[PDB]
Coordinates of C-alpha atoms and ligand atoms in Angstrom, one line a residue:
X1 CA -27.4 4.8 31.6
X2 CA -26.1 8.5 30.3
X3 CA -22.6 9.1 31.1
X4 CA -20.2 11.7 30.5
X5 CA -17.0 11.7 28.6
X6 CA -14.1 13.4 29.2
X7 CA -12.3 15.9 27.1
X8 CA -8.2 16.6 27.6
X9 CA -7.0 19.8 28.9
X10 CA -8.0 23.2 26.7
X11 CA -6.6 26.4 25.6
X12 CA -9.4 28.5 24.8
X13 CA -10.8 29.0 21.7
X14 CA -7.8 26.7 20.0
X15 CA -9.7 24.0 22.4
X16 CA -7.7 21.1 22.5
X17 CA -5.6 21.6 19.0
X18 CA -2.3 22.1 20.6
X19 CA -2.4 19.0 22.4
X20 CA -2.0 17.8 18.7
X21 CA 0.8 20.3 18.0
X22 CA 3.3 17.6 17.9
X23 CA 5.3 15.1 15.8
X24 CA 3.8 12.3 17.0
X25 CA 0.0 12.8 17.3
X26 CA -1.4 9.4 17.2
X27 CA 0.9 8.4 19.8
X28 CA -0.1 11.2 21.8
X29 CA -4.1 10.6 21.0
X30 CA -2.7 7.0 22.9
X31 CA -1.7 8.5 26.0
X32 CA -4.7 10.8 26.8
X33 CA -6.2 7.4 26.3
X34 CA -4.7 5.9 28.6
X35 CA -5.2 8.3 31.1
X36 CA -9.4 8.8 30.0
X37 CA -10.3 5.7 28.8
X38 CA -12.3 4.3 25.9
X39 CA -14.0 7.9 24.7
X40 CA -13.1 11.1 24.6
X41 CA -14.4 14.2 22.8
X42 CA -11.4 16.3 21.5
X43 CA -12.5 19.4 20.3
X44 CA -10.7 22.0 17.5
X45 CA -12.4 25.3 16.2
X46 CA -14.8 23.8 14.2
X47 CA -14.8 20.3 14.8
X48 CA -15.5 17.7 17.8
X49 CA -14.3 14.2 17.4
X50 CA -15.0 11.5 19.7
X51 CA -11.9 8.6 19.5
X52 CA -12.7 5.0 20.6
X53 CA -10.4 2.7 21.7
X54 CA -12.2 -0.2 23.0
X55 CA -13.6 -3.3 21.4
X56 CA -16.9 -3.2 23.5
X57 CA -17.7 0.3 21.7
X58 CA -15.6 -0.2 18.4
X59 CA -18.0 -3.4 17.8
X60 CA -20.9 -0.8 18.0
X61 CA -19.6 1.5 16.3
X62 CA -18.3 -1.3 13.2
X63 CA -22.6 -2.0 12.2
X64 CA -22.8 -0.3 8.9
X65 CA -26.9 0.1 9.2
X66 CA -26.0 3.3 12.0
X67 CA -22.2 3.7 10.9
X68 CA -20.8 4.7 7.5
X69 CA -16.8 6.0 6.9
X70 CA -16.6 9.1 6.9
X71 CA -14.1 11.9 4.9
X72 CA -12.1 12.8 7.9
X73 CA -10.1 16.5 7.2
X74 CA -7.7 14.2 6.3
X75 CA -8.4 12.5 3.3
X76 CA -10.7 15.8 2.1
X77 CA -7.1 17.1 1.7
X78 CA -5.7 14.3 0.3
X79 CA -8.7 14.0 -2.4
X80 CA -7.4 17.1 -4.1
X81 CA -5.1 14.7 -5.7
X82 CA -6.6 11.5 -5.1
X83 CA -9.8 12.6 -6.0
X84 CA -12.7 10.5 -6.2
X85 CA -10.6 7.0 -6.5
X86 CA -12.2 4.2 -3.7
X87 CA -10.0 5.9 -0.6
X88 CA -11.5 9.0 -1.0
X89 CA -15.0 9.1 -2.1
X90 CA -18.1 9.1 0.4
X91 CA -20.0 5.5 0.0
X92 CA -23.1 7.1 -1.6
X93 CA -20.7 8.9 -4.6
X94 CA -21.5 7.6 -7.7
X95 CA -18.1 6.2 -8.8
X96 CA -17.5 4.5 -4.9
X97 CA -19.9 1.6 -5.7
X98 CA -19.0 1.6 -9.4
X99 CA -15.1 1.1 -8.9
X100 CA -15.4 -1.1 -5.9
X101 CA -18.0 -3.6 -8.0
X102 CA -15.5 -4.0 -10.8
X103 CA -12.4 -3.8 -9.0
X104 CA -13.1 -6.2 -5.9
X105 CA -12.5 -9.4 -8.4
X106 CA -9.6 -8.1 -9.3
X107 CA -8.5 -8.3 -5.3
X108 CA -9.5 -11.1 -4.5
X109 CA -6.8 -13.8 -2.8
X110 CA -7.1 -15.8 -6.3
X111 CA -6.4 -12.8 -8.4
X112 CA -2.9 -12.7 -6.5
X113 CA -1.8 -15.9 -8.5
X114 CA -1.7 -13.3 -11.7
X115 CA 0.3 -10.6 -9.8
X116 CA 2.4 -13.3 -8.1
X117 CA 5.0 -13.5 -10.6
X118 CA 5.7 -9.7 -11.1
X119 CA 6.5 -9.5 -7.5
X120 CA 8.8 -12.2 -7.4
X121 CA 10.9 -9.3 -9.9
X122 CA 10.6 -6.7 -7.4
X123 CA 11.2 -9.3 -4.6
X124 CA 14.4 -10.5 -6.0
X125 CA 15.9 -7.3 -7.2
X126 CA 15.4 -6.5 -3.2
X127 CA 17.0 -9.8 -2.1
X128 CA 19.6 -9.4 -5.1
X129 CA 20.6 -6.1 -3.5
X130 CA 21.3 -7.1 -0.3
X131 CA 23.6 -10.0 -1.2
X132 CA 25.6 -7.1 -3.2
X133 CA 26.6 -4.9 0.1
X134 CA 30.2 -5.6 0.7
X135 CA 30.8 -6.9 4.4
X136 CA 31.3 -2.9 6.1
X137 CA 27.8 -2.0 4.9
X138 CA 24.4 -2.2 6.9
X139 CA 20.8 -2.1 5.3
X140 CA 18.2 1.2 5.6
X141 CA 15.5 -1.3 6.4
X142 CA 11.9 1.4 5.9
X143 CA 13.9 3.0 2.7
X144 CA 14.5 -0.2 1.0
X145 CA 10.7 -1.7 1.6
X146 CA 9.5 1.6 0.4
X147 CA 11.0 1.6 -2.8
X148 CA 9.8 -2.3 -2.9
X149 CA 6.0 -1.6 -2.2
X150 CA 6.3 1.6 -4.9
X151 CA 7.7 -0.6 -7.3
X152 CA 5.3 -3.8 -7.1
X153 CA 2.3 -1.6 -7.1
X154 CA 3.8 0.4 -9.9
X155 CA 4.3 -2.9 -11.9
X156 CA 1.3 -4.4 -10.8
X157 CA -0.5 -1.2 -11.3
X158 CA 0.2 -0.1 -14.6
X159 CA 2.8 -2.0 -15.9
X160 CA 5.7 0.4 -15.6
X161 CA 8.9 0.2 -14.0
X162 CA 10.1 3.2 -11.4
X163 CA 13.7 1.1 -11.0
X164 CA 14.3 2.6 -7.8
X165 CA 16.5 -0.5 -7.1
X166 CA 18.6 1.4 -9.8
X167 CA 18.9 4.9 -8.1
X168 CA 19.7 6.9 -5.4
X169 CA 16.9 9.9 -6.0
X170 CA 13.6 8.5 -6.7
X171 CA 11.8 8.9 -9.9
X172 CA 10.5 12.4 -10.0
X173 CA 6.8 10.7 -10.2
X174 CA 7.5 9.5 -6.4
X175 CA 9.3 12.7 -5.4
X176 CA 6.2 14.7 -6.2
X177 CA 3.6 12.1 -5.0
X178 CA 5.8 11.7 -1.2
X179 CA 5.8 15.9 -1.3
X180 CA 1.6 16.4 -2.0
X181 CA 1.5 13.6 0.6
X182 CA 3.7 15.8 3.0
X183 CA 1.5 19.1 1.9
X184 CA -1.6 17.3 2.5
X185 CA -0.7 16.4 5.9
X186 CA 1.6 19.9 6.8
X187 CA -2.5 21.6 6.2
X188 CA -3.9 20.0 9.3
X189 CA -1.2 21.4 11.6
X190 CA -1.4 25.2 9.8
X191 CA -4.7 26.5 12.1
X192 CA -3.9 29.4 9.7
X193 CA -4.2 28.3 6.1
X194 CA -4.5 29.7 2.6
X195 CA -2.1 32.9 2.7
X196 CA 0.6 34.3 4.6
X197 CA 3.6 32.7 2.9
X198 CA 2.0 29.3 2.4
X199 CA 1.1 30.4 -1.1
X200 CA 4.8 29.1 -2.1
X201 CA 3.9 25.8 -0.9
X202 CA 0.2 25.9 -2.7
X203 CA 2.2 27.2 -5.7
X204 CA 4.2 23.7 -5.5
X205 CA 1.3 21.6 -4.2
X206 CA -0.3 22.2 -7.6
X207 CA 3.0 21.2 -9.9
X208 CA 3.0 17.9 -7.7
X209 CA -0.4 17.0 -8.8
X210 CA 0.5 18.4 -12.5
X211 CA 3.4 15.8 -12.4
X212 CA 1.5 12.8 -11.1
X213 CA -1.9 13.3 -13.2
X214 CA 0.7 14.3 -16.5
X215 CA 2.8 10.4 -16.3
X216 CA -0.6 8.6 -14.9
X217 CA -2.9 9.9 -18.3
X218 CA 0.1 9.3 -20.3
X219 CA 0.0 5.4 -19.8
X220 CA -3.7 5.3 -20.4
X221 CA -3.7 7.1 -23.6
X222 CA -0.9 5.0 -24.9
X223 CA -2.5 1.6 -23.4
X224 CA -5.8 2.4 -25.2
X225 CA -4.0 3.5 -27.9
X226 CA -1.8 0.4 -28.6
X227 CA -4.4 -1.6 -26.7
X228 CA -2.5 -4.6 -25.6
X229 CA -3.5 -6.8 -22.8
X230 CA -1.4 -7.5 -19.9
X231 CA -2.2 -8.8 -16.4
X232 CA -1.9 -5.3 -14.1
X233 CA -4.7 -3.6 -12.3
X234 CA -5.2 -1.1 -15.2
X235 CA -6.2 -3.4 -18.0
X236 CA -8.9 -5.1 -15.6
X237 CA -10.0 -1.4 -15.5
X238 CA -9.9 -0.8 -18.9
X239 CA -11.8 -3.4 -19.8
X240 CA -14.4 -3.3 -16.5
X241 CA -17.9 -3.3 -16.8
X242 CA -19.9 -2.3 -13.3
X243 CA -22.6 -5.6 -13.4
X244 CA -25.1 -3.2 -11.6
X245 CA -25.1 0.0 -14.1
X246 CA -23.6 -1.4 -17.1
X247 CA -20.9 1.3 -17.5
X248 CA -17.0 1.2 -17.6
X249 CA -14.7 3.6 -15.5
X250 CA -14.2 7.0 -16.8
X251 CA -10.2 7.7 -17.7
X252 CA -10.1 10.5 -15.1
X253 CA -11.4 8.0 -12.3
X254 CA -9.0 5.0 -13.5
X255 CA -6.2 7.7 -12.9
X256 CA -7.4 8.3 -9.5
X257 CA -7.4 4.6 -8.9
X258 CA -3.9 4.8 -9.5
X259 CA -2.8 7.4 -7.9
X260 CA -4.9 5.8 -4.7
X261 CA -3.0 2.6 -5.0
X262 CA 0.1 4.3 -4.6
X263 CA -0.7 6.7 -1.8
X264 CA -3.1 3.6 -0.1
X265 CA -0.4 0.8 -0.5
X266 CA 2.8 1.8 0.0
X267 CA 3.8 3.4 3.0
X268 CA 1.5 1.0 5.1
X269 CA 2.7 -2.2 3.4
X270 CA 6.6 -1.1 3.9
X271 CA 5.7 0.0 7.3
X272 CA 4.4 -3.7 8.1
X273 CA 7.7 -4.7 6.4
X274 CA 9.8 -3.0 8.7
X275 CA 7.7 -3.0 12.2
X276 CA 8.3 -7.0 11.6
X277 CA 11.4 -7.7 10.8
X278 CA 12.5 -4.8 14.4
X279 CA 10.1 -7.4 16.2
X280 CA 11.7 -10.6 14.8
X281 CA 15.4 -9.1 15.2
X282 CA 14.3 -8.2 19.2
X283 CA 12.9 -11.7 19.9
X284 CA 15.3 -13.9 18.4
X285 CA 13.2 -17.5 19.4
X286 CA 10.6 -15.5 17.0
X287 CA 13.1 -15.2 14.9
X288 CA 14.6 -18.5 14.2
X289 CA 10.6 -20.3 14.5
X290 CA 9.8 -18.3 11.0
X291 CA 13.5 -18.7 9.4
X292 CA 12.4 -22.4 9.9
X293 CA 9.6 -22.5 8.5
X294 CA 10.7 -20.3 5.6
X295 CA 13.7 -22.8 4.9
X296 CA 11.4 -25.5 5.1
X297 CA 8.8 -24.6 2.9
X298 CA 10.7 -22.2 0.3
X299 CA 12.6 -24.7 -1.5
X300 CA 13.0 -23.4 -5.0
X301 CA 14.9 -20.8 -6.1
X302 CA 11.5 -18.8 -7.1
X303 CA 8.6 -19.0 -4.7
X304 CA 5.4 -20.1 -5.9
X305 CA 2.2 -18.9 -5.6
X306 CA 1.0 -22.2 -2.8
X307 CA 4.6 -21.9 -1.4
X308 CA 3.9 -18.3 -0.3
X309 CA 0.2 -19.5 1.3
X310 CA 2.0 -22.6 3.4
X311 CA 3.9 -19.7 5.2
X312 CA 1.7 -20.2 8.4
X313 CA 4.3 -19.0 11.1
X314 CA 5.6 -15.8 9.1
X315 CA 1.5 -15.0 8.6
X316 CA 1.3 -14.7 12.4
X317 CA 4.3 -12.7 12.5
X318 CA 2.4 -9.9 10.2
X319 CA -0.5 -10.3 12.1
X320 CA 1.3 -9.8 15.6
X321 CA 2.9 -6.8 13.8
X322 CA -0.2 -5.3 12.8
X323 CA -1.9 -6.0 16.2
X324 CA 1.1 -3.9 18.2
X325 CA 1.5 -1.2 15.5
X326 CA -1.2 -0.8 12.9
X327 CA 0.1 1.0 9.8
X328 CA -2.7 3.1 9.4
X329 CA -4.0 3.3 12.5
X330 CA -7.0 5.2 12.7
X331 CA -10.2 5.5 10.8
X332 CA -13.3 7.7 10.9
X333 CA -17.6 7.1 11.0
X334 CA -19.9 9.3 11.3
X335 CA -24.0 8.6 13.3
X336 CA -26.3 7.8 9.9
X337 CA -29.2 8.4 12.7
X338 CA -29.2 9.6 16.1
X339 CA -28.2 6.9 18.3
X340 CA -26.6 5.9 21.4
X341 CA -23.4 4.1 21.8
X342 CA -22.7 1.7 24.6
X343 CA -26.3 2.2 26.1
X344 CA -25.2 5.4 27.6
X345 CA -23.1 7.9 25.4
X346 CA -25.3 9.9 23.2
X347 CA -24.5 10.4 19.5
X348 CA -26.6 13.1 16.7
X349 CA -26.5 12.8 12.9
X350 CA -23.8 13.1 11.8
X351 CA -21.4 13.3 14.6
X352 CA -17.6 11.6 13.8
X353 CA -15.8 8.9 15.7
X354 CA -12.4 7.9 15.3
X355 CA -10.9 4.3 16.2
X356 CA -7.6 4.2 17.4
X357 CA -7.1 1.3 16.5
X358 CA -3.7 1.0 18.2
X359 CA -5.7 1.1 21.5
X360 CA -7.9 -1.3 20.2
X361 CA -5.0 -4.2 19.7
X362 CA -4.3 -2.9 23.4
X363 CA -7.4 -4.1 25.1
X364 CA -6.8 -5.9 27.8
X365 CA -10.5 -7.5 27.9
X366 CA -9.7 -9.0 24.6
X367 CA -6.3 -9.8 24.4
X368 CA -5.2 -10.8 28.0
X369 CA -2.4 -9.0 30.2
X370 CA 0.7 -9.5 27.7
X371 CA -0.6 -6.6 25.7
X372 CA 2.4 -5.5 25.2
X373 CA 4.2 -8.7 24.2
X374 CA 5.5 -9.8 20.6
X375 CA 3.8 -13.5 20.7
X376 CA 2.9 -14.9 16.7
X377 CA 1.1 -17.5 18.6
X378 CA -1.8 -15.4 19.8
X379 CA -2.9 -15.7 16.0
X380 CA -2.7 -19.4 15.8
X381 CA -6.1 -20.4 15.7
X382 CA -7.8 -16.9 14.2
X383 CA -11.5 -17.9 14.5
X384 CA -10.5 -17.5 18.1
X385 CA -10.8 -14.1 18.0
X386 CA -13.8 -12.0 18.8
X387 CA -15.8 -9.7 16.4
X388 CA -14.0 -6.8 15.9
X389 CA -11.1 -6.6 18.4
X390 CA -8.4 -6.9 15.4
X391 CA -9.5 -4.1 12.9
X392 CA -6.0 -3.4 10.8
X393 CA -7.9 -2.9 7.5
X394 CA -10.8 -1.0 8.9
X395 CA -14.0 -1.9 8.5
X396 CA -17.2 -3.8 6.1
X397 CA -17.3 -2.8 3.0
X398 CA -15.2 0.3 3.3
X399 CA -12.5 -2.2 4.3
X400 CA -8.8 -2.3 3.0
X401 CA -9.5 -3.6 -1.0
X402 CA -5.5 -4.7 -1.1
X403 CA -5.9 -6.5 1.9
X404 CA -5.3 -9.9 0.2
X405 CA -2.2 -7.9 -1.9
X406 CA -0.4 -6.5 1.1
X407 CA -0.1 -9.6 2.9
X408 CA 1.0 -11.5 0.1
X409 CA 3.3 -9.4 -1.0
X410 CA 4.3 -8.8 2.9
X411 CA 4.5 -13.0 3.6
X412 CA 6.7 -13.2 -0.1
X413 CA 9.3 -10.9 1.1
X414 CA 9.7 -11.7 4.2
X415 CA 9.5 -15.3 4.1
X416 CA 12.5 -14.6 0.9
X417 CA 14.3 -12.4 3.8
X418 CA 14.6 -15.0 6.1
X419 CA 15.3 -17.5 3.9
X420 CA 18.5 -16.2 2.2
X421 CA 20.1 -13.8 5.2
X422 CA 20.7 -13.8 8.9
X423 CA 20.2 -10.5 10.4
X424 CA 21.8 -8.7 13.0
X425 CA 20.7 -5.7 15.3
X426 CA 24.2 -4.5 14.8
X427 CA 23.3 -1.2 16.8
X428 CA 21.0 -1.9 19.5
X429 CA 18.5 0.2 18.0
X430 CA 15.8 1.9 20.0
X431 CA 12.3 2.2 17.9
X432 CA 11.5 5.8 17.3
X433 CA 8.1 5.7 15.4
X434 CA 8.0 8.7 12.7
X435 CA 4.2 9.5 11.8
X436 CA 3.3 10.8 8.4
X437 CA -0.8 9.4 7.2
X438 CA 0.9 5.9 8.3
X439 CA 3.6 4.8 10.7
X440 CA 7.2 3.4 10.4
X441 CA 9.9 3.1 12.2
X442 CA 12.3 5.8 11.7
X443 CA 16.3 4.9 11.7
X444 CA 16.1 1.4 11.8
X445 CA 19.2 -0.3 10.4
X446 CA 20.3 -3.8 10.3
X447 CA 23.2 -5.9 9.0
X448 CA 22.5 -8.6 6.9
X449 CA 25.0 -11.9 6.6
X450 CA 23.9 -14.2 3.5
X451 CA 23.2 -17.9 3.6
X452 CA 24.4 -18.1 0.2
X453 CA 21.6 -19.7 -1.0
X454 CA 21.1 -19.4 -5.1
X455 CA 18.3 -17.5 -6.0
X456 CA 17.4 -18.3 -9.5
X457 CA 16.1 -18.0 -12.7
Ligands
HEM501 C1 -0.3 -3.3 5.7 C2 -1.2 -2.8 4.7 C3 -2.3 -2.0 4.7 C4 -3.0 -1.5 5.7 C5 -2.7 -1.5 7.2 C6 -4.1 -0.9 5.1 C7 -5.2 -0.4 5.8 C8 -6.3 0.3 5.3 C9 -7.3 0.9 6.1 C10 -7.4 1.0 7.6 C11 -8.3 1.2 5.2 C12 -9.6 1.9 5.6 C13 -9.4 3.4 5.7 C14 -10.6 4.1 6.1 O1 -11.6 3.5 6.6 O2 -10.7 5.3 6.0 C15 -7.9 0.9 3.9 C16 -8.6 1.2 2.7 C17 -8.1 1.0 1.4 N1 -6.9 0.4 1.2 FE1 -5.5 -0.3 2.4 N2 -4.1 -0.8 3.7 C18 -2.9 -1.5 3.5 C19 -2.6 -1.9 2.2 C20 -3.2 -1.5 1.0 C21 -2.7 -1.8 -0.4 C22 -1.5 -2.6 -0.8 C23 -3.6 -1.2 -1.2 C24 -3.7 -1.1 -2.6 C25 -2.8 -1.6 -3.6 C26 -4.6 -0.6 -0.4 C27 -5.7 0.1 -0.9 C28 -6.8 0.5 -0.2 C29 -8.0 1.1 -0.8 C30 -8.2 1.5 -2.3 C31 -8.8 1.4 0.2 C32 -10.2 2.0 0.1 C33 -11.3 0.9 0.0 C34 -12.7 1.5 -0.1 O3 -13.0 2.4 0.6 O4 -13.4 1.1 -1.1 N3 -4.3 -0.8 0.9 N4 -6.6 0.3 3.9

């Protein structure tokens, strides 16, 4: 029966928009959760938002017949330069159902047999690197698996190498790509856009994009132009045909898609990365479980394709990551009809929801009392696990496409990591989480001591 809601503190007329004036939002959205509960309305001039953080509303508010995604502000900022690719678009856009029919083949868990072997390169140039520092040298753990996720997706994407194994400043193509990133998300804060002296920033916003659409249209010309076939994302693009309308992708969406690949997969997949190997280097009987396992099962120099799927242990190690900190960690619906959520809050056309789904992987109800506990073995029998309670890569059919890629990628490295190095927490370090669109953990350094162990080819 109709209940109320609360709503954090206020400041008139900014509403609740400083309470968001911080560094950290989403872990600030999680403690005026704790303290309201499993809704609450925040308000900001202009818009009301209602965040959800447990599984007995998240289920309801996961049926796609009275729930579609919606274009938070967001990723309507982020669309000026990822345009209409599949992150971006609305579900009843045109080019939505068109890239998602031809591409979803293309990411499926038996397409990553064709990708496998071009991230074994970027794997082993990783692993190659770290058998190279001298003994008074420590690894940057998130620096290192970014420039490992922008290269595979790079290589996988298009076919072309950034070598950021190879250099200290990235490849001006990343440099501008991290910096719209950073615009796009600076615009949210800036409750006073478009011109006093942010016009110098809009000024540079626009050469970013200049720089990113310039190298991505560049490839395509050329790959059309030559017209050979190799086994990355853009030749099953080139030669797609949608089954439902009969017609290919249009260059300027294909460029999108890339450009969304980039900015979908490679903070969140690095992130993963490095929020698991903090949590196996903390809990060091995690630790030496999944070393074993990797040991055991990766016993060629090269891993191949059914080796990295026989990595059982190291998969509940990503999930258990993903459960305590969620890369991307909140998603947004909005009411197709009215309706009412729960049997007692009322909802109108139209009005957005957000999961946090940190708060979600927190719910006591679903997961027990050790909430807040690193244990692998939670996952060990996954069917185990109620209807929506572990939501990671969101939801239906607006669900993460490179689902399938970032944990294979994510079980390949890491099961390679743990194969070939000890690792030591060589400074005690305390997680500080740094939040951008996605979270990571900022500072983390380790030491790693090699096995010696040949790794091949
Ligand atoms: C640890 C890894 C990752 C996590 C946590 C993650 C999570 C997500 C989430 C939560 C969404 C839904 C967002 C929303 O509803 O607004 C999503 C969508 C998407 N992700 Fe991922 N992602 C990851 C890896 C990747 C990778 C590697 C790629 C691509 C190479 C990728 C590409 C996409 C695309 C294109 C969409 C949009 C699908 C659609 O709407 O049709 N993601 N991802």
């Amino acid at each position: 029966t109709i209940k109320e809601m609360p709503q954090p503190k206020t400041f008139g007329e900014l509403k609740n928009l400083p309470l968001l004036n911080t560094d950290k939002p989403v872990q600030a959205l999680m403690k005026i959760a704790d303290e309201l509960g499993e809704i609450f309305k925040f308000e900001a001039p202009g818009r009301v938002t209602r965040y959800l953080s447990s599984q007995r509303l998240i289920k309801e508010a996961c049926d796609e017949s009275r729930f579609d995604k919606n274009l938070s502000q967001a990723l309507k900022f982020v669309r000026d330069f990822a345009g209409d690719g599949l992150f971006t678009s609305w579900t009843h856009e045109k080019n939505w159902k068109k890239a998602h029919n031809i591409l979803l083949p293309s990411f499926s868990q038996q397409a990553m047999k064709g990708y496998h072997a071009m991230m074994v390169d970027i794997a082993v140039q990783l692993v190659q690197k770290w058998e190279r520092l001298n003994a008074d040298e420590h690894i940057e753990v998130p620096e290192d698996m970014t420039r490992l996720t922008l290269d595979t997706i790079g290589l996988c994407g298009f076919n072309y190498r950034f070598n950021s194994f190879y250099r200290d400043q990235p490849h001006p193509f990343i440099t501008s790509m991290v910096r719209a990133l950073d615009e796009a998300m600076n615009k949210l804060q800036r409750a006073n856009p478009d011109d006093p002296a942010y016009d110098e920033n809009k000024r540079q916003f626009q050469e970013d994009i200049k720089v990113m659409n310039d190298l991505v249209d560049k490839i395509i010309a050329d790959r059309k132009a030559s017209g050979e076939q190799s086994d990355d994302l853009l030749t099953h693009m080139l030669n797609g045909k949608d089954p439902e309308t009969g017609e290919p992708l249009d260059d300027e969406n294909i460029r999108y898609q890339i450009i969304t690949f980039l900015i979908a997969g490679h903070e969140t997949t690095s992130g993963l990365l490095s929020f698991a190997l903090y949590f196996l280097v903390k809990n060091p009987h995690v630790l030496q479980k999944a070393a074993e396992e990797a040991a055991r099962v990766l016993v060629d120099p090269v891993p191949s394709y059914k080796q990295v799927k026989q990595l059982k242990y190291v998969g509940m190690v990503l999930n258990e990551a993903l459960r305590l900190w969620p890369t991307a960690p909140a998603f947004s619906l909005y009411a197709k009809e009215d309706t009412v959520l729960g049997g007692e809050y009322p909802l109108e056309k139209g009005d957005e929801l957000m999961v946090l789904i940190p708060q979600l992987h927190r719910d006591k109800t679903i997961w027990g009392d050790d909430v807040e506990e690193f244990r692998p073995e939670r996952f060990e029998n996954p069917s185990a696990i109620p209807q929506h309670a572990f939501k990671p890569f969101g939801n239906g059919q607006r669900a993460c496409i490179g689902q399938q890629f970032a944990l294979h990628e994510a079980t390949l490295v890491l099961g390679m990591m743990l194969k070939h190095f000890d690792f030591e927490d060589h400074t005690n370090y305390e997680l500080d989480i740094k939040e951008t669109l996605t979270l990571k953990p900022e500072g983390f350094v380790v030491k790693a001591k090699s096995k010696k162990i040949p790794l091949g080819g």
